[PDB]
Structure formats: structure tokens, C-alpha cells
């Protein structure tokens, strides 16, 4: 019993974190095979950060200008290239700790674990959702640039995120491991602000199922609804439209509890309009939207990894 927000065990990734230094700036890198991956704004200075010329600044850099430390050991750089917003440093040694991995790009609403690091050292791990405005609400202090987010499938690590910057509202923005930003952001010291966010409706439903699985059920009612009636209510409360697809991923939970998806939907729409009656669900006084359906299944059936 019980239900916590839960991250993937981080061991496979802590073996990959290194420290990267270019002049006065030091940040984190991801050492896989013989390549170290890190944000390309490491080559920047404070002077040319309002308008970087990243191709221009790169070639002028020597392979020995980049200093890569893995713990007490130094890594010689024998080459570099830039892929979108990610720098790649070729080193002469393969990482003996490289796990099975693959680079994936995630969809808004999907969750992942973040390994926050500083000076190449893993500091903490936590669970984030890719918000619909393509930010994540993380916890990142100065020097956490280059920290990575990931999921684990069986024994394959899926790297989905690499941290680049903080937005003025305190939310965070980054790229996939191929250097493409999530959302309408750029890595320049310019003025940027996240779009308007929406509740990940399917995640709220999954969380309500997790509450029912755990015996927390005061919100269930006798009513049902349809996609059309629900969505008209959802827009006015700034909720993501519930598609036919969403219902089918909720299938397993709809089976294991005996509450149909449109049945659960009528409970959620009542909570939207009436409120929570000063009560809590799963020890929360707000509708939690950072648990995906797979997160609830993985946690309420005990999937383990390697």
C-alpha cells in the first residue's frame, strides 16, 4: 500500500556523469562510449552570450581547450562537433560504465527522472513531467546545466532531456540528447517566457485511479459523461482535451478498479466545478497531474529494473 512520487533508480546514469570545463565555465557532461555530451553554451562567455555565433566560437576552440574530468581522472579530447544545441566531445577512452541506452524525445505529459548534478557529481534524483508549455518544474541551482533526465525500460536507459537554463518564472527548459530544445526556447541571454500551461488531464485521471486502488474513494459518484461534454468543461478550466487515445491507455486501470473512464471523468468534472470539499486525495489537496498511467501501473504492480 501507499503511493509516492517515485524516480527510477539512478545507478546506471551516475556512472555516466562527468565534469566539463571551457575557460571559466564548468558544467556537467554525459559520458557514453567515447563521447561526452553537454550543452553547447559551455563555450560561451558573458560577453558573447547575448548573441552567440556558435559555429564561429566552436572552430576557434582547441581539443585541449576543453577540460573533461571524470572524478580524479582527466579525459583527453581528441575531437568536437556541435549537434543542434548539444556539444559532443570525442575522448580517447570508452566509458566502461556505459549502460544499454538510447536517445528518445518525449511527448508533453510524459514523465521522467532527473539526476541533478553539480561539478560532475550526482546530487539528487527527482521525478518531473514535461509540461504542455514544454517546461519542467524542476529544482536546479547554478551549475546544474548538463544534468540529464531519463526513463528505464527493462534494462535500457532512455535519455530524454538535458538541462540548459532557468526561465524567469523559475521553471526550466532544455533539449533532447540530439540538441533540439523542447518548446519555443533558444540558448541566448535574451528575454524568454514560457507559454500558458494546461493540466495534463489523462495524468489526473490516472492519479484518481491510483487513489481508488489505494482505498481513497470519496469522490466517486454514479454519473458518467462523454468526451464532448467533458472537454467543453475542460477548456474552461484550462485542461488538456481528453482524446479517444487517452481513454484507451487508461484501460488497464479502468479494468482493475471497476470504474469506467467516462465514469471517472464525471468524478473529475465534478471536482473541477464543485471543488475538493476541503478534503484530500492521496494526501494532496490539489489535483495532481504528474503521474502518467504507466507510472501508476508500474508502481501499483511492482515493476523492477535490471
Amino acid at each position: 500500500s501507499g503511493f509516492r512520487k517515485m524516480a527510477f533508480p539512478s545507478g546506471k546514469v551516475e556512472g555516466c556523469m562527468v565534469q566539463v570545463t571551457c575557460g571559466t565555465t564548468t558544467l556537467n557532461g554525459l559520458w557514453l562510449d567515447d563521447v561526452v555530451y553537454c550543452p553547447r553554451h559551455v563555450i560561451c562567455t558573458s560577453e558573447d552570450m547575448l548573441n552567440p555565433n556558435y559555429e564561429d566560437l566552436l572552430i576557434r576552440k582547441s581539443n585541449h581547450n576543453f577540460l573533461v574530468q571524470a572524478g580524479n581522472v582527466q579525459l583527453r579530447v581528441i575531437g568536437h562537433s556541435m549537434q543542434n544545441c548539444v556539444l559532443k566531445l570525442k575522448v580517447d577512452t570508452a566509458n566502461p560504465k556505459t549502460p544499454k541506452y538510447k536517445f528518445v524525445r518525449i511527448q508533453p505529459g510524459q514523465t521522467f527522472s532527473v539526476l541533478a548534478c553539480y561539478n560532475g557529481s550526482p546530487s539528487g534524483v527527482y521525478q518531473c513531467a514535461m509540461r504542455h508549455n514544454f517546461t519542467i518544474k524542476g529544482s536546479f541551482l547554478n551549475g546544474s546545466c548538463g544534468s540529464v533526465g531519463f526513463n528505464i525500460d527493462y534494462d535500457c536507459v532512455s535519455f530524454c532531456y538535458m538541462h540548459h537554463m532557468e526561465l524567469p518564472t523559475g521553471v526550466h527548459a532544455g533539449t533532447d540528447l540530439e540538441g533540439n530544445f523542447y518548446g519555443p526556447f533558444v540558448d541566448r541571454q535574451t528575454a524568454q517566457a514560457a507559454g500558458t500551461d494546461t493540466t495534463i488531464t489523462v495524468n489526473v485521471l490516472a492519479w484518481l485511479y491510483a487513489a481508488v486502488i489505494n482505498g481513497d474513494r470519496w469522490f466517486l459518484n454514479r454519473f458518467t459523461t462523454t468526451l464532448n461534454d467533458f472537454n467543453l468543461v475542460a477548456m474552461k478550466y484550462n485542461y488538456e482535451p481528453l482524446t479517444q487515445d487517452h481513454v484507451d491507455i487508461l484501460g488497464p486501470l479502468s479494468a482493475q478498479t471497476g470504474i469506467a473512464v467516462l465514469d471517472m471523468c464525471a468524478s473529475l468534472k465534478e471536482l473541477l466545478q464543485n471543488g475538493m470539499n476541503g478534503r484530500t486525495i492521496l494526501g494532496s489537496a490539489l489535483l495532481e497531474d504528474e503521474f502518467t498511467p504507466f507510472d501508476v501501473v508500474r508502481q501499483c504492480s511492482g515493476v523492477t529494473f535490471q
Copy 2:
């Protein structure tokens, strides 16, 4: 910036979990050097779960009654002894991934990370706190017995909890790594029930300071209170009483923000009286009590680690 419920990286503990089987019972064990630790109820059968005589049960076991597997590999048990409610199995191989570690016993309000495991394999990692009724509100399924709680300050792993059982209310009870239960609980399937759970006041106050550090200000007021008057009010909301030691502990955060501890107590008292008015603090719509003053400092100022 930002503030999240954060766990320690789990790699150092992942290298230590193994699967321990006795008869038809399988749970998790902790493999450090040449000892594997696990809950001693792994040696119970179904006839010995109301009033098990563990000394009697254990002397009847041979080393070959215990199957220990680290992944693909079988560990040969060469001895066994009992320390309070924890079994210790000596094996012929020290664990090559044993980290630097120690065993500590924690006090209520303290937080730690939990590496939940099944059949010796990690399923996930989350943060917990030891409540004042000496339970934790974990997330455990059947087969999670033997999972451990830990902190990693610097490079030393501090093991402070091993999971033994779930109580009829959904909460969990366990031991330190010396086999002593937290609280009045026993590893018997007899009727047991958690004492009243109080809100961990010093942690709430710490979280409110973390909010101010992060820029939240809407809940501040111009009142201050005495320590006695605050405890009279907070008691009525089932809050833990605040001692002078707690006031000292909040001193550093108090200095960093400029808000006196007793003046933040006045803010908490008002929040209990009016609730949140639909607003949030640090992303939450209730008052969080699972962050220590130490947790707040580590996350809000330099952590590195």
C-alpha cells in the same frame, strides 16, 4: 531555483541488494562486505506467524536452507546469526560494490530515501520521513520486505531503515540496521496499530522558510507569538509541539531570510486558521512536513555532493 521532493542517487545502494529465499519465502537482503542483512521473519512459515519463537526457528536452520542470489549468481551461505529482528548471513564472498557506509538510528521528523525492491531488484526510489508515531508512509507492495532507507551525505551511505511490515492503516514499520524496531511494533502478525500521527511542526516551518527563500511571500504577517501560545494553538491542529531545540535548529534559515522563528510561527498559526484560500505554497496546496531544516539548506544553497 525550484523546490522538489528529492531523493539521493541510488546507485551506491543498488549495488548491494540481493534476493534472499528461505523455504518458500523470498524477500530482499542487503549485501555489505561478507554479510547479507534481511528481516528475520524470512524464516517463518505459515504456522509460525502469530507468536514465532525466532531463536527456536533459527537454530533449526542450516546454511543450505538459505538461497541468496545476486543477479545471475548464487551466494554460498557459510554462517548465520540473529541480531534483534534482523538476520545476518555470512557468505564466502565480500561484495565488491560495498560503498563506504554506516548504520544510524534516526529520530522522528528525520527524512531518508527509500530504494523499493522486489526479488532483489530495484523498482524505484522515493523520499520518506519517520513520523512521530514511528511509522513511515512508504509505498510498498508484497515482496518489498528488506528494502532499505538511507541518506548519502558526502560519500558515506547512512542506512537507517529496513522495511519489515505494513500496518492495518496502510502505513509501514521497520527496524534500524541493528534490528531494533522503530516504535512499539514487533515482527509478529498479532494485532498492532499506529499511535496518533502528528504534523511535524519544525519541518513545516522549514518548508515555509524554503518558500520565502524561493520568493513566496503571500502567507507572511506582521504578528509574532510566544513559544507557549503557539504550542497551545498548534496542538489543537494535531501539530507536534515546538521545543526550544527546534527554535535553535531553525536559526540558520531564520538568519538567511530575516524572519524570526517566532514570527514565522505566527504565519503558520494564521494558515491553520484560514487555510490556503485556493493558493499554493511551493507548488503544494497543503502544508508539507517531510522536509527537514537540513533538507531545505541542502537544496536551496550549495549542494554539489
